[PDB]
Amino acid sequence: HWGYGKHNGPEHWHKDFPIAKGERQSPVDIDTHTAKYDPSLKPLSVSYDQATSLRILNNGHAFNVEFDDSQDKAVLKGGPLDGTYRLIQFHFHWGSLDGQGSEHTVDKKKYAAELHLVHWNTKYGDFGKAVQQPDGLAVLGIFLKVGSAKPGLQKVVDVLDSIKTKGKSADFTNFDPRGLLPESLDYWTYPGSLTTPPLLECVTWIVLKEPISVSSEQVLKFRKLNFNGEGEPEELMVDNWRPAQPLKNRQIKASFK
Template structure:
């Protein structure tokens, strides 16, 4: 039996219908824009808000086991995409729920949904910035901690959610994994519309090839009500998207019949938080050190014998 993620998505944490916001209006510009979120929603003025600017010269190296992705290579049995008035959000059904653990995460997290943030042109769009550099798009894969049993319970915990952030950079060619989504976007130009997606690609297709290098910090949802419950992973490597594909996202309309563009929150103060970057595990480092010492010993012996 296929496992449906529709029920866990009913809270629509990343959508404007968020139950936590009580239906309060918000947007990215004007009187309900990002500059006013803190006064509209008290939690949006917290001390551990997201996104942030990641300063690579000011990160702490950590040694974690590589991510373990379970069911990430299995194509979904069904996929849907929705224009929620703020973003394009993708939901899916699968025979077995995709899960992620390790990579410094404390527990196993179950996939819920993914969505995008983009700009009006390719000079901006991502929520996180790296050394001040903003990418044209950022993809967020949202997971909730399995130990808490449900998304509803997980959002009450400080470590309830784990979000994988993936940057997208412009390529001259289309990204095949995004093509079915882009095709479906034509059917959801108006806010509140949804469409079926040709579910050919597994979740792994939306991640960069290299998962070993990433940044980690504790933060919040990047939309109201900005709950500070997210363990953030931002991968150092990007995936690609073409300008043609980006323009399909920019053609979506919000509740006011205006194009959905620049749907990103500006970087928030880091305050006293630490940002970490992954590195090779202690075991790998120890093994390399052992190999290095062995080579050094053998080289020294060879030189000694030559001089005898």
């Protein structure tokens, strides 16, 4: 029954998921003045040319755009990754205001939203087996700031009215996640976890440097989603982000000087 309210939010997750106080928990604050530049980092490889979007779903915490991950259609190689990682779904973490909403923070700066493209390591068979492995997931973190309208997002924004409440799902085929990427693929990387329960410490996090801009009219329709199910009292789906967690014995490496 976890969520982001006052009585089931990120401050109560450790009572049902004691790994919330673990070692490699996410998100964290990316301190650009302590993030070491790693010249041995390879360029990222985003092969989304055969990505197959299937469905968009309101799961009571966010909205997920699921992809056909039965084959290596949309993968993520290069960077710090050893092997292939299939894009399975992406989602967003936003807030009620433009000064908050992102999960990762850059020098304590909060962005309006944060895009998470989730990939699972193919050598583990399926997603359920990869989440139990330290190098099982690779999530690509892309910040969203309020500004010009992002054209690659309008197809996502226009469909939100059909998935307003929890449990609603809608067809969402032929979507191209390449439009959601910024111009540059410079990134930070650090070993992390899921930012939602069960908070499994299985994620190699890749947070891109360059944010993307979205018009306030776009991010406003993110805030018109409902946490509740249909017929229940309306609770706006806002501030569905986890605050930053202690970095502890972890080093964030950057692909750019």
